[PDB]
Amino acid sequence: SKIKLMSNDRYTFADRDWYSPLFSYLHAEGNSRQGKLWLVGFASDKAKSIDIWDKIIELEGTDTNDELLAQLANRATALNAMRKKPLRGDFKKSVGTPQIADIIPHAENRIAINAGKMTENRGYSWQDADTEYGELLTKVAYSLEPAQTVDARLKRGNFISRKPWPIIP
Amino acid sequence: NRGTVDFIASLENLKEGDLGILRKLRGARLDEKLPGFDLFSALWWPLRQKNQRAPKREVAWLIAKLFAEFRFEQREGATLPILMGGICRKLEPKKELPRVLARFDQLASLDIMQMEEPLSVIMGILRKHQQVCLDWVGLTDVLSFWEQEPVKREWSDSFIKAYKI
Amino acid sequence: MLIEIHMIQNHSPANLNRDDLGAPKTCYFGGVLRSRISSQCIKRSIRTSNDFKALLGGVRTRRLADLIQQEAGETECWKKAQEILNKCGFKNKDDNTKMLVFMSKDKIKDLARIVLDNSLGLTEAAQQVANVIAQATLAPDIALCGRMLEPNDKDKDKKVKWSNTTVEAALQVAHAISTHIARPEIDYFVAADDVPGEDAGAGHIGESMFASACFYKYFSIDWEQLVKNLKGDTNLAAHTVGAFLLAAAKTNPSGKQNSFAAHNYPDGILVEFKNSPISYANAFVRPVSVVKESDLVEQSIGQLSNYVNDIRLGYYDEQSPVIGFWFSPNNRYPLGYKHSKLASRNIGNLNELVGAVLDYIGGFKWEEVQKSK
Amino acid sequence: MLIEIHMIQNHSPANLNRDDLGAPKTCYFGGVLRSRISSQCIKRSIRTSNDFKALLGGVRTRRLADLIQQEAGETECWKKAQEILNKCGFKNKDDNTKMLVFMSKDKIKDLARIVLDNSLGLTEAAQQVANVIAQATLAPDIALCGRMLEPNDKDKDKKVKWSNTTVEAALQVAHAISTHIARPEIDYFVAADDVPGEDAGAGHIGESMFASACFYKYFSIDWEQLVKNLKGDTNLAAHTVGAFLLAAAKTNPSGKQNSFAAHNYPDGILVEFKNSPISYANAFVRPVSVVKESDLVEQSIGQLSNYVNDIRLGYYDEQSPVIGFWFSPNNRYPLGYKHSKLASRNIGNLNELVGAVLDYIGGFKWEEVQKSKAY
Amino acid sequence: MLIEIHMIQNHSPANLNRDDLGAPKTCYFGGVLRSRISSQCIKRSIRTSNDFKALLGGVRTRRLADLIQQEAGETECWKKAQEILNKCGFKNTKMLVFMSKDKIKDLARIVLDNSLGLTEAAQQVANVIAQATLAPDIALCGRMLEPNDKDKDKKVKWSNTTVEAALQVAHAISTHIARPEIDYFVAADDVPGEDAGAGHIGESMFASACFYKYFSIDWEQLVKNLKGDTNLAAHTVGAFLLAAAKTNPSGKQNSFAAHNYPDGILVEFKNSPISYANAFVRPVSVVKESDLVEQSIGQLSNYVNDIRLGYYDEQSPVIGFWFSPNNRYPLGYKHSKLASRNIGNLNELVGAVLDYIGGFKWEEVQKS
DNA sequence: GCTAAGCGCACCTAATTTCCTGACGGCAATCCT
């Protein structure tokens, strides 16, 4: 379980990581099967008992898209990549935008309700769920660009289209 | 809105010498020259008495001086961030366009008593491109309403939508 | 060597320079309103004067195609001249060439038509046109007022190359500012209809605006730059300097002179020779106030004399001694009633002032410099 | 020891410095609009002046290869010089390098020795060229203005190493702010078509903009830094100080002076000698309002004298004294009427002021410092 | 015992501080844009001020091995200094290390150049670096250091390197609305060409504003940092006052020679720090009468009167000195007669605050 | 004790170029052995 309160350089804390144990379980042991998937995740680092959570996912077993479920298997990478992108800048060891790091949890919690439709990809996909970040992005961009000017509006609009581009592994 | 359209009409009915004494008064206040104050009284006091929605003193003085300087006709649907902003599509986007954009950007950070000079250079850019019409009524009721944030917001994204066509 | 002319000229109530509305041109000097005559107005009045007529070579015209066309043959304007000038970099907006072409009049116009008369093809005759235009350079008013022609590069073919078209100006003219606080005045005019076919109306009613002022004019001529610009014709440069001195005094701006006649000759002219330029406009930071026993011109000349004495005693008294000549009409106004010898010669005639200036420039008599052009 | 020159100069209606749109350069010095001349314009006018001609020798160009070809004579080698410069870290776009090079004019001969040398290769010749360019800091104007030279590292040979190419500036120029409420006027110029034609209109219609203002110019020269950057040439440093004073007083920026011949000399020069740099712009925080019985220049000097007396009484009464010389043309405009003892010396001549300044510096006649020039 | 300095300083058009894009630093205060000068810039300008050469005693460098090697005419020891520093905890030419200059010179020369053991030599170097906290600039600005525990050996222990800062500096915010301005500069080619174009075109950014500056010195913490030598503490306080009054940040000063001096300094002695920036929550607008420094001083005097008539302790009276050059700008123009000791000389002000501090004169304390 | 009509212009042209920097610097602990 990828849960820790310590938001590091390479980690961005969002929410319960139901997305993580999906590629291996839906490939090797259990595969696609009609039923409910109960996940229990006890996050730990040596003797540090971090957090325990559980989740229930509905499932029918409507095939399995390989690369999309693999992309879904690590959402924390794309979330950290979106957090690390600065307002204006090119350096890579910066904290990026820390105000985004407080609105990623709510959008992740809103996404995690329809986790079955996310996983089987009936009408929910990466593009359809990451547009739930839109209103939080607008109202964070209002804070980060608190000017009523043309350039502030254009840079706010560039802040709007920020979304977690998926990655292959 | 009443009180503003008749103000624009009376400004447009002003003759050449009156516009000249307004032109010479540009750049300073109206406490150092008599005929500027007499003209402001003549063009304000009866229209202030007749209507409750008369514009505020300093914005009316600013628009009077700017109309004397530039003399563009009143036409509906020809506000500043449409005309400039359509002008901002024909420039070089990497160097010249950011500079004219910063010239228009400066306008959002002045009070009412130094505002006439950045407006003057913006209207000079307008005059260099043969622009005959300006929404004078629109400019003055959005300038008298300058105390709020939504008015500058709709100003700005009007410039944006004029830019994206 | 720099020849410097400071002129004090009181004008009648008039409107010599005006903006788009018709208000007389005004500046603010010393925090107060001053009447202004612009420098290009004085420059074109000098250029188009009767005394500078003999040295007026040059066109500065955006209708150069018609100037090429003026042969009896009419088969080179609509096709040949327009296309060649378009290829050179001057587009046409309804049969005029947009760019103003400042260039020498006689010989360069004569040479351009032999380019535009048959054979040798396009993109090579355009090169001859560019070569003859960039190499004109030989005219007194071009030498004084400079030159430009920078054509557009988008329409021009890449096979035509341009030389350096920049000619450095040898003349610096300051804007003629008033010596006192300007009083803008409004004449109310009524145009009366001659036929009484209706009630006693008028016709057109309006305002004209005018002012009266005592102007300080400043001119600076670089002798070596003039010599270099005419390619070493020293007699031409001396003739140009003398005719400029005559035309600055005897010719007024050509504004509303039909209704406001202000042909007032200058009643004080100070001509100095120095290697560095100064302008005695800071004398009139304090505007001249008229006291009962005197006149505005006398007080303006007194302030000018005070400032000239202060500048001369406070900036240089050795090495270069700065030779100056003071001209007043029949010595009507002395240059200061205080201690004398501020000007090396109090000349009571303009032609003698021209002769003295040309003598100090190197002994050119006025007679044989007139034969230069 | 630090030399401060504070100049009050009333200029005629002119556009000395303008931005990209032709507007005169304006600033907001305390909430109100003032007319501004940037320090780069004044620095260029001082540097390219007749009074500063002898102390030249600094060239700032992207066409160093053209200078090398001109010095080498009729031996071509322009492409060879361009190859050496490209290997040095100066990438050529079409004919000039991509970055500006500031260097002493006398060392170009040394460069022409390295480029024309056919025995040496490309990397060693580049190293010698870099050594000559980095060491070419013996010009007075380079010592006044400073330098930075950072070559292109990507297009640089690995066997090319640069020494320290940074010299500190010994001159600080402030932006000349107007003492009063500036306001520009729109000159409605027109261009006359000399041919009659049929339109009877015009050739061109446009908007020039001009302004008239009384400017406060500030110059600061670090004496020991100027001596150090000239490696101990005290006569050269005195020559630079004197020619700088003549250039600051007598030379004006050459911006549209053909149309606005504003060659007005300063109406007041306060030359002070002190250890720390101080400035009197705060005198004109309140804009000068002209009264009828006084003058804009007179009131400007009066306000300057008020602030100078206040600063001297509240800031400059220690064991270390501040000596200032006040220059007006023939004592036309004196200092503050309420004190009349503010300046240590009320000099009424520019040459006498320069002589007094040089006598204070170490004792320096104008004649024997005019005989030591770098070119 | 807290010494509080509130200064009002009007500046010429200048760019003292810039961000990544070369723009003057701006901050939102009271809902409007204000020109900002960073506190670190003011601290650096004070530490590198001409009134600090006799008092500067600290170096914050990562090139410590260069400093240790520089005290050796022929004793070439640079790789061994780098190795002992690398084992000390720095990981490389190191991280930034702040301590005294004479201390690093003398002690590092007598410690690391000695031919001796290796780990305990690193422990000795670490003890020397940590214990070298006797410098008044280190005492004012403050310092703590943490070395990398990975590259450090397990046999090297570090003592407490935490130096509590006795100086608090606020960011200088403008009393009026920020006025960002653009300067369009070119760079002319000194050799001619056939085209007449500049060598470079750019846009500098500058702003002229009336800044409010705020400093706070903790006297008990200052004498705890510099130990019992109170003479050096008084010298540090006087040098701070002189440097803050008489030094400007070294931004683009070669192009913008803005060396204006402050028109008003309030030095107050109280046990609780007060920020008077809330006086300028409402932006200062210019009027026909008076100027910006007068309006800002009037607003500041109004707020000072409101604070003294508001937050007031009978057990601890509030007391402060007002500064104006030759009494040019009075504080309480209308009614607020709070400044008891309007002082028209900087040396007199320094003497008065040193006398309130205790039995110290400026000439007596200028010897430590 | 203090008047009142009528009359208030529009056409022409509004420009071109070219240059726009580079390198350097980016921290560590401490939050289960």
Coordinates of N, CA and C in Angstrom, one line a residue, chain B residues 16-160:
Chain B
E16 N -14.8 73.4 -31.5 CA -13.3 73.2 -31.7 C -12.5 73.9 -30.6
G17 N -12.9 75.2 -30.3 CA -12.2 75.9 -29.3 C -12.3 75.4 -27.9
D18 N -13.5 74.9 -27.6 CA -13.8 74.3 -26.3 C -12.9 73.0 -26.1
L19 N -12.9 72.2 -27.2 CA -12.0 71.0 -27.2 C -10.5 71.5 -27.1
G20 N -10.2 72.6 -27.6 CA -8.8 73.1 -27.5 C -8.4 73.5 -26.0
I21 N -9.3 74.2 -25.4 CA -9.1 74.5 -23.9 C -9.1 73.2 -23.1
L22 N -9.8 72.2 -23.5 CA -9.7 70.9 -22.8 C -8.4 70.2 -23.1
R23 N -7.9 70.3 -24.3 CA -6.7 69.7 -24.7 C -5.5 70.3 -24.0
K24 N -5.5 71.6 -23.8 CA -4.4 72.3 -23.1 C -4.4 71.9 -21.6
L25 N -5.6 71.6 -21.1 CA -5.7 71.2 -19.7 C -5.3 69.8 -19.4
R26 N -5.0 69.0 -20.4 CA -4.6 67.6 -20.3 C -3.2 67.5 -19.5
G27 N -3.1 66.6 -18.6 CA -1.9 66.3 -17.9 C -1.9 66.9 -16.5
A28 N -2.9 67.8 -16.1 CA -2.9 68.4 -14.8 C -4.4 68.4 -14.3
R29 N -4.6 69.0 -13.2 CA -5.9 69.0 -12.6 C -6.7 70.2 -13.1
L30 N -7.8 70.6 -12.5 CA -8.6 71.7 -13.0 C -8.7 72.8 -11.9
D31 N -7.8 72.8 -10.9 CA -7.7 73.9 -10.0 C -6.7 75.0 -10.3
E32 N -5.9 74.8 -11.3 CA -4.9 75.8 -11.7 C -5.3 76.6 -12.9
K33 N -6.4 76.2 -13.7 CA -6.9 77.0 -14.8 C -8.3 77.2 -14.6
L34 N -8.8 78.5 -14.9 CA -10.2 78.8 -14.8 C -11.0 78.1 -15.8
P35 N -10.8 78.3 -17.1 CA -11.8 77.9 -18.1 C -12.0 76.4 -18.2
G36 N -11.0 75.6 -17.8 CA -11.3 74.2 -17.6 C -12.3 73.9 -16.5
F37 N -12.2 74.6 -15.4 CA -13.2 74.4 -14.3 C -14.6 75.0 -14.7
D38 N -14.6 76.1 -15.4 CA -15.9 76.7 -15.9 C -16.5 75.7 -16.9
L39 N -15.8 75.1 -17.8 CA -16.3 74.2 -18.7 C -16.8 72.9 -18.0
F40 N -16.0 72.4 -17.0 CA -16.5 71.2 -16.3 C -17.7 71.5 -15.5
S41 N -17.8 72.7 -14.9 CA -19.1 73.1 -14.3 C -20.2 73.2 -15.3
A42 N -20.0 73.8 -16.4 CA -21.1 73.9 -17.4 C -21.5 72.6 -18.0
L43 N -20.6 71.7 -18.1 CA -21.0 70.3 -18.7 C -21.3 69.3 -17.6
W44 N -21.2 69.6 -16.3 CA -21.5 68.7 -15.3 C -22.6 69.1 -14.4
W45 N -22.6 70.4 -13.9 CA -23.6 70.9 -12.9 C -25.0 70.8 -13.3
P46 N -25.4 71.2 -14.5 CA -26.8 71.0 -14.9 C -27.2 69.5 -15.1
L47 N -26.3 68.8 -15.7 CA -26.5 67.3 -15.9 C -26.4 66.6 -14.6
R48 N -25.6 67.1 -13.6 CA -25.7 66.5 -12.3 C -27.0 66.8 -11.6
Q49 N -27.5 68.0 -11.7 CA -28.8 68.3 -11.1 C -29.9 67.6 -11.8
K50 N -29.9 67.4 -13.1 CA -31.0 66.8 -13.8 C -31.2 65.3 -13.6
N51 N -30.1 64.6 -13.4 CA -30.1 63.2 -13.3 C -29.4 62.7 -12.0
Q52 N -29.9 61.6 -11.4 CA -29.3 61.0 -10.3 C -28.2 60.1 -10.6
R53 N -28.1 59.6 -11.9 CA -27.1 58.7 -12.3 C -26.0 59.4 -13.1
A54 N -25.6 60.6 -12.7 CA -24.5 61.3 -13.3 C -23.1 60.6 -12.9
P55 N -22.2 60.6 -13.8 CA -20.9 60.0 -13.5 C -20.1 60.8 -12.5
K56 N -19.2 60.1 -11.8 CA -18.3 60.6 -10.8 C -17.4 61.7 -11.4
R57 N -17.0 62.7 -10.6 CA -16.3 63.9 -11.0 C -15.0 63.5 -11.8
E58 N -14.2 62.7 -11.3 CA -12.8 62.5 -11.8 C -12.9 61.7 -13.1
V59 N -13.7 60.6 -13.1 CA -13.8 59.8 -14.3 C -14.4 60.6 -15.5
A60 N -15.4 61.5 -15.1 CA -16.0 62.4 -16.2 C -14.9 63.4 -16.7
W61 N -14.1 63.9 -15.8 CA -13.0 64.8 -16.2 C -12.0 64.1 -17.1
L62 N -11.7 62.8 -16.8 CA -10.7 62.0 -17.5 C -11.3 61.7 -18.9
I63 N -12.6 61.3 -19.0 CA -13.2 61.0 -20.3 C -13.3 62.3 -21.1
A64 N -13.6 63.4 -20.5 CA -13.6 64.7 -21.2 C -12.3 65.1 -21.9
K65 N -11.2 64.9 -21.1 CA -9.9 65.2 -21.6 C -9.5 64.3 -22.7
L66 N -9.8 63.0 -22.5 CA -9.4 62.0 -23.5 C -10.2 62.2 -24.8
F67 N -11.5 62.5 -24.7 CA -12.3 62.8 -25.9 C -11.8 64.0 -26.6
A68 N -11.4 65.1 -25.9 CA -10.8 66.2 -26.5 C -9.5 65.9 -27.2
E69 N -8.7 65.0 -26.6 CA -7.4 64.7 -27.3 C -7.6 63.8 -28.5
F70 N -8.5 62.8 -28.5 CA -8.5 61.8 -29.5 C -9.7 61.9 -30.5
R71 N -10.9 62.3 -30.0 CA -12.0 62.6 -30.8 C -12.5 61.4 -31.7
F72 N -12.9 60.3 -31.0 CA -13.5 59.2 -31.7 C -15.0 59.2 -31.6
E73 N -15.7 58.8 -32.6 CA -17.1 58.8 -32.6 C -17.7 57.7 -31.7
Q74 N -18.9 57.9 -31.2 CA -19.5 57.0 -30.3 C -20.3 56.0 -31.1
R75 N -20.0 54.7 -30.9 CA -20.6 53.6 -31.6 C -20.7 52.4 -30.7
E76 N -21.9 51.8 -30.7 CA -22.2 50.6 -29.8 C -21.4 49.4 -30.2
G77 N -20.9 48.6 -29.2 CA -20.2 47.4 -29.5 C -18.8 47.6 -30.0
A78 N -18.1 48.7 -29.6 CA -16.8 49.0 -30.0 C -15.9 49.4 -28.8
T79 N -16.0 48.6 -27.7 CA -15.3 48.9 -26.5 C -13.8 48.6 -26.7
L80 N -13.0 49.0 -25.7 CA -11.5 48.9 -25.8 C -11.0 47.5 -26.0
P81 N -11.3 46.5 -25.2 CA -10.6 45.2 -25.4 C -11.1 44.4 -26.6
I82 N -12.1 44.9 -27.3 CA -12.4 44.3 -28.6 C -11.5 44.9 -29.7
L83 N -11.5 46.2 -29.8 CA -10.7 46.9 -30.8 C -9.2 46.6 -30.6
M84 N -8.7 46.9 -29.5 CA -7.4 46.4 -29.1 C -7.6 45.0 -28.6
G85 N -6.9 44.1 -29.2 CA -7.2 42.7 -29.0 C -7.6 42.1 -30.4
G86 N -8.4 42.8 -31.2 CA -8.3 42.5 -32.6 C -7.1 43.1 -33.3
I87 N -6.6 44.2 -32.7 CA -5.4 44.8 -33.1 C -4.2 43.9 -32.7
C88 N -4.3 43.3 -31.5 CA -3.4 42.3 -31.0 C -3.3 41.0 -31.7
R89 N -4.0 40.8 -32.9 CA -3.8 39.6 -33.7 C -2.9 39.8 -34.8
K90 N -2.6 41.0 -35.2 CA -1.8 41.3 -36.4 C -0.4 41.7 -36.1
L91 N 0.1 41.4 -34.9 CA 1.5 41.7 -34.4 C 2.3 40.4 -34.3
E92 N 3.6 40.7 -34.1 CA 4.5 39.6 -34.0 C 4.4 39.0 -32.6
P93 N 4.0 37.7 -32.4 CA 3.6 37.1 -31.1 C 4.7 37.0 -30.1
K94 N 6.0 37.0 -30.5 CA 7.0 36.7 -29.5 C 7.5 37.9 -28.8
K95 N 7.7 39.1 -29.5 CA 8.3 40.3 -29.0 C 7.3 41.4 -28.9
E96 N 6.8 41.8 -30.0 CA 5.9 43.0 -30.1 C 4.6 42.8 -29.3
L97 N 4.0 41.7 -29.6 CA 2.7 41.4 -28.9 C 2.8 41.4 -27.4
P98 N 3.8 40.7 -26.7 CA 3.9 40.9 -25.3 C 4.1 42.3 -24.8
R99 N 4.7 43.2 -25.6 CA 4.9 44.6 -25.2 C 3.6 45.4 -25.3
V100 N 2.9 45.2 -26.3 CA 1.6 45.9 -26.4 C 0.6 45.3 -25.4
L101 N 0.7 44.0 -25.1 CA -0.1 43.4 -24.1 C 0.2 43.9 -22.7
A102 N 1.5 44.1 -22.4 CA 1.8 44.7 -21.1 C 1.4 46.2 -21.1
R103 N 1.4 46.9 -22.2 CA 0.8 48.2 -22.2 C -0.7 48.2 -21.9
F104 N -1.4 47.3 -22.4 CA -2.8 47.2 -22.0 C -2.9 46.6 -20.5
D105 N -2.0 45.8 -20.1 CA -2.0 45.2 -18.8 C -1.8 46.2 -17.7
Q106 N -1.0 47.3 -18.0 CA -0.8 48.3 -17.0 C -2.1 48.9 -16.4
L107 N -3.1 49.0 -17.3 CA -4.3 49.7 -16.9 C -5.1 49.1 -15.7
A108 N -4.8 47.9 -15.4 CA -5.5 47.2 -14.3 C -4.9 47.6 -12.9
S109 N -3.9 48.4 -12.8 CA -3.2 48.7 -11.6 C -3.0 50.2 -11.3
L110 N -3.9 51.0 -11.8 CA -3.9 52.5 -11.5 C -5.2 52.8 -10.8
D111 N -5.1 53.9 -10.0 CA -6.2 54.6 -9.4 C -6.7 55.6 -10.5
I112 N -7.7 56.5 -10.1 CA -8.3 57.3 -11.1 C -7.6 58.6 -11.4
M113 N -6.6 59.0 -10.6 CA -6.0 60.3 -10.9 C -4.6 60.2 -11.6
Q114 N -4.2 59.0 -12.0 CA -3.0 58.9 -12.9 C -3.4 58.1 -14.2
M115 N -4.6 57.8 -14.3 CA -5.1 56.8 -15.2 C -5.0 57.2 -16.7
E116 N -5.0 58.6 -16.9 CA -5.1 59.2 -18.2 C -3.9 58.9 -19.1
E117 N -2.7 58.7 -18.6 CA -1.6 58.6 -19.4 C -1.4 57.2 -20.0
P118 N -1.6 56.1 -19.3 CA -1.6 54.8 -20.0 C -2.8 54.6 -20.9
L119 N -3.9 55.2 -20.6 CA -5.0 55.3 -21.5 C -4.7 56.1 -22.7
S120 N -3.9 57.1 -22.6 CA -3.5 58.0 -23.7 C -2.6 57.2 -24.7
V121 N -1.6 56.4 -24.1 CA -0.8 55.7 -25.1 C -1.6 54.5 -25.7
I122 N -2.5 53.9 -25.0 CA -3.4 52.9 -25.6 C -4.2 53.5 -26.7
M123 N -4.9 54.6 -26.5 CA -5.7 55.3 -27.5 C -4.8 55.8 -28.7
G124 N -3.5 56.1 -28.4 CA -2.6 56.5 -29.4 C -2.3 55.3 -30.3
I125 N -2.1 54.1 -29.7 CA -2.0 52.9 -30.5 C -3.3 52.7 -31.4
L126 N -4.4 53.0 -30.8 CA -5.7 52.9 -31.6 C -5.7 53.9 -32.7
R127 N -5.2 55.1 -32.5 CA -5.2 56.1 -33.5 C -4.3 55.8 -34.7
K128 N -3.1 55.1 -34.3 CA -2.2 54.8 -35.3 C -2.7 53.7 -36.3
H129 N -3.8 53.0 -35.9 CA -4.3 52.0 -36.8 C -5.7 52.4 -37.4
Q130 N -5.9 53.7 -37.5 CA -7.2 54.3 -38.0 C -8.4 53.6 -37.4
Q131 N -8.6 53.9 -36.1 CA -9.8 53.5 -35.5 C -10.7 54.7 -35.2
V132 N -11.9 54.7 -35.8 CA -12.7 55.9 -35.7 C -13.7 55.9 -34.6
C133 N -14.1 54.7 -34.2 CA -15.2 54.5 -33.3 C -14.8 53.8 -32.0
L134 N -15.3 54.3 -30.9 CA -15.1 53.8 -29.6 C -16.4 53.9 -28.8
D135 N -16.6 52.8 -28.0 CA -17.8 52.8 -27.1 C -17.5 53.7 -25.9
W136 N -17.7 55.0 -26.1 CA -17.4 56.0 -25.1 C -18.3 55.8 -23.9
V137 N -19.6 55.6 -24.1 CA -20.5 55.3 -23.1 C -20.2 54.0 -22.3
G138 N -19.8 53.0 -23.0 CA -19.4 51.8 -22.4 C -18.1 52.0 -21.5
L139 N -17.1 52.7 -22.1 CA -15.9 53.0 -21.4 C -16.1 53.7 -20.1
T140 N -17.0 54.7 -20.2 CA -17.2 55.5 -19.0 C -18.0 54.8 -17.9
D141 N -19.0 53.9 -18.3 CA -19.7 53.3 -17.1 C -18.9 52.2 -16.6
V142 N -18.0 51.6 -17.4 CA -17.1 50.6 -16.8 C -15.9 51.3 -16.0
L143 N -15.6 52.5 -16.4 CA -14.6 53.2 -15.6 C -15.1 53.8 -14.3
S144 N -16.4 54.3 -14.3 CA -16.9 54.7 -13.1 C -17.2 53.6 -12.1
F145 N -17.4 52.4 -12.6 CA -17.6 51.2 -11.8 C -16.4 50.5 -11.5
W146 N -15.2 51.2 -11.4 CA -13.9 50.5 -11.3 C -13.6 49.9 -9.9
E147 N -14.5 50.1 -9.0 CA -14.3 49.7 -7.6 C -14.4 48.2 -7.4
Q148 N -14.9 47.5 -8.4 CA -15.2 46.1 -8.2 C -14.3 45.2 -9.0
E149 N -14.2 44.0 -8.6 CA -13.4 42.9 -9.4 C -14.2 42.3 -10.6
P150 N -15.5 42.0 -10.5 CA -16.1 41.4 -11.7 C -16.1 42.3 -12.9
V151 N -16.1 43.6 -12.8 CA -16.0 44.5 -14.0 C -14.7 44.3 -14.7
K152 N -13.6 44.3 -13.9 CA -12.3 44.0 -14.5 C -12.2 42.6 -15.1
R153 N -12.9 41.7 -14.4 CA -12.9 40.3 -14.9 C -13.6 40.2 -16.3
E154 N -14.7 40.9 -16.5 CA -15.4 40.8 -17.8 C -14.6 41.6 -18.8
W155 N -14.0 42.7 -18.4 CA -13.1 43.4 -19.3 C -12.0 42.5 -19.8
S156 N -11.4 41.8 -18.9 CA -10.2 40.9 -19.3 C -10.7 39.8 -20.2
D157 N -11.7 39.0 -19.9 CA -12.0 37.9 -20.7 C -12.7 38.4 -22.0
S158 N -13.3 39.6 -22.1 CA -13.7 40.2 -23.3 C -12.4 40.4 -24.2
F159 N -11.3 40.8 -23.7 CA -10.1 40.9 -24.4 C -9.7 39.5 -24.9
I160 N -9.8 38.5 -24.0 CA -9.4 37.1 -24.4 C -10.3 36.6 -25.5

